[PDB]
Amino acid sequence: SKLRKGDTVIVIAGKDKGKQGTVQAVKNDRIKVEGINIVTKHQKPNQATGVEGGILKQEAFLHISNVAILNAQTQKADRITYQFGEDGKKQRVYRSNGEVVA
Amino acid sequence: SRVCQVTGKRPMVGNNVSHANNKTRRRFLPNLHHHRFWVESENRFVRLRISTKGMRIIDKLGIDKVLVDLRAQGQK
Amino acid sequence: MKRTFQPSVIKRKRTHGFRARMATKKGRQVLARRRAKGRHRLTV
Amino acid sequence: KISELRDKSLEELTQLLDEKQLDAFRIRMAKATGQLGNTHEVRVNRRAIAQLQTLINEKQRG
Amino acid sequence: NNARLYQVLRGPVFSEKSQMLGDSLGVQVFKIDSKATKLEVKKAVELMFEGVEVLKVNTLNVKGKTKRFGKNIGRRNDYKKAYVTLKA
RNA sequence: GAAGUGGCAAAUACCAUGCUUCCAGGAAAAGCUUCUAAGCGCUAUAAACGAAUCGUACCCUAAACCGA
RNA sequence: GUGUCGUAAGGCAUGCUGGAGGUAUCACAAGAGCGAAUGCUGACGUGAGUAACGAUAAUGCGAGUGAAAAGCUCGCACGCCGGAAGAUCAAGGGUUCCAGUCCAACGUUAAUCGGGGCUGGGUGAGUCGACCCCUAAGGCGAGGCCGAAAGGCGUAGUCG
RNA sequence: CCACUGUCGUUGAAAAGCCAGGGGAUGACUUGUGGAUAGGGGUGAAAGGCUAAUCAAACUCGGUGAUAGCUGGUUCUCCC
RNA sequence: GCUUCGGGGAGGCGGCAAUAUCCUGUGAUCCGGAGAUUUCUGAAUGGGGAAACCCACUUACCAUAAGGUAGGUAUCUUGAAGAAGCGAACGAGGGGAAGUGAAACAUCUCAGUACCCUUAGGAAAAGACAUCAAAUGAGAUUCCCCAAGUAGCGGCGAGCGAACGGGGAGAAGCCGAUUAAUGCUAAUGUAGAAGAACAGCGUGGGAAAGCUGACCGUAGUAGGUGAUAGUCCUGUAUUCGAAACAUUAGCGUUAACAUAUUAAGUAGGGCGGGACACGAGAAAUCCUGUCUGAAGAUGGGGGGACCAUCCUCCAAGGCUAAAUACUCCUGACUGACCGAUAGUGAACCAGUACCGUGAGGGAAAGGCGAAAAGAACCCCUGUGAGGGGAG
């Protein structure tokens, strides 16, 4: 919820701990980050639909608490906070420093 | 039903008691009779299913008083 | 040999049916009891 | 799309609803004869009909 | 009214009986609304197919079949179909 | 791309809700035909148009009903 | 499983399995200990690969298909019913009807077959039946009668 | 429609049948459909028969965990 | 699922359960308030009926054909308004067992219980003395602790079993302590918002665990996250939002009903019953089926037969909050409660399957993994089942 599809994060727990990528999907509590948590899928070929089949490599959802937003300046894991501006606009803000970007 | 209109008497429940004190459920019924009461104020006979006590109440209070009390009570 | 259940739709609906239940106070208590147990079949 | 219908008067809302009824009939016939690839359109037409009838109810009540 | 006739015809019937009825007698088979009368079917056909005349409508109710799927026993909807005879 | 009409036999079906007998004495109501009451359309001749709705598959001396 | 310790109930250690919990000590509280109750539930034995395979109307062969054919299809022959074991219904059932496809389970064997699975199809009415008009038995029953209450009866009627 | 005799069957093909015989078969006959009578009540050409495979008082639920001077069972260990 | 008003801000078109076409910063999905739509059956209400069906009558309008739209048409009560039906427990009322106990059994017990029937309200009922007491008197009703298993009752058996008074809770007395609306003011609830602080190293599939060193704390024993987290996520402490609607109070106002004036078929009595802890007893007191029947304040009721004296209180008009009873439900919280033969019958598509004509009876059945990464491809086999490799 604090992380939405598009922003660059860093996984802080799991087998891919340390690597960074950009979010592709957030279902409820899981998150899909490209290039991270790659599973090998044995796809049975299909005749009717257009899929081919083979041994694919695709990213899998991991737990959303296993990734952290990547600070663009410090290049380290960070937390998110919310800042209501004087204009009444709610913006995500880095917990470490506080800049509005991401 | 077996209810007096003017007094409200209805069957009572109780016990038949034998000499050996055996108890059986019994009823006590009102002494109810059909009677045509002459009403001068309407120049007519009105037939009531009334108890003996109700007939005495007619005697003491008047058919007009009893009739207005029944009409206030409802069924007429 | 002849057995106990000889089905007839009119006879079933006339002794046990919904309107037969609703015609009596005791049949309505049957229905209230079936609804309180939550039966998916109220009446035949 | 609801702002495009709220401005319209009842007299033309009724006629647009009738057009939508005929539209729904033809979508159904094309669906049965397998000539409607974009299958999302039947639901949007049904919900447009619902909107038109709601607005007609409003404009007739007051 | 002219908004009830738009719901009378639910769609055509495509089968071998329907195909050969169309070929031999030029009669259209429709799945119709469960509550439509022969007069309503006649009016709906004549309104939705401009230029045709209806001689005869034959209707029938067909009960839906029971198809146990997965763990459940369920049944398909009943439906009504109309055989409509048109002017040659 | 043929024939398709003569004899005889013959039902428990039909005439027949008849006929004859008996006593144990043999539904009802409506449709239908007439009559009028209060009150104020009907009969012929046709011509056109109609006759809705539900059922109709299949078993049924049975492997489909009643008997687990 | 093993080793070891205690009079016993039992304790301790440890190999293997297992993969996320457990609990010293001292108190405290018990759904606190099972072999029996023709105990209760589930699982699995013995009987035993035993009895039986449901009318003694009956089958033989050639082709076909198939992984496979006594049982399916086709053919020839044989046999059985024929006031039915044929045909039409009502009642009851409810898709079992027809085609294609499948053979695990179901079918007392096998099954390519099926009333089995799956997918499609199929029921067409002014005249047939229902509905409808009418009433029987018998119901219900404005008012009415009766009855502690609940209710019971009953006229006109209204159903059937 | 019935059910007199026998064999069979008795973990049946069947919780009352089969087979071979047997009785009534225009009548106090059989049978369809609908209805009526309800538990100390019904109904009974009377056997205490029948009243849904239940009848010297149906079935279901409830009083109810009836009562049972009776039968069965009653679970770890050691010491006196 | 349609409209609107608020919330919210990136995904979404309910689950099994995915796929497709798509929607979404022109603010979707989602959440909260309001509205619109709302088939047929069922009180079912136009008549009827084997519930989900059959058959209508009528008014207005439209159509010209065989109809369509919008209505109306049940019964009863009260003088147009109401009612009906359903649904937990608790209340009040009309009827009212038996098993059982008495080591039999009939009085008695069980028990005014079960059950049947009627009908309310958030409670109901009762309630202001024609009550007790006998003390220096107290001062309505209800409920709790005592009194007390006492005094009594009782085939004086089995059993049943008070009161006076004391200590508490709560308190209130009236004659309009009624009901329903509407309108203000306040408060609440029904969506929400922000919300601190952790790194390194080693092991490990994975770190939250180990070692080292930090930080927050009005937030440290919450649920998760690939093993055990105050600092990763959701949260927690704390501070907080309402366009709309509800609810609670206070106020004001309306319209419905009510507003006794001191009580005769009454008190008392005979007979038969019932209730009183009290079973006829020496039996007061209460209730009444039957038959009777006063005095009316210079009078009457009670003080456990009854009489006298003394005390006390005025029946035959009505009302009255709290303290008390309960849980079909809503919210928060809890547990030396269960953990799949347990705990609901029911953790699972359960009051289901199944059984029964029916009333009714009534199951079984949870767990891959952290993530489907649910095993591409090859081989045997009948394109089966099943397996062996590969992954």
Ligand SMILES: [Mg+2]
């Ligand atoms: Mg019998």
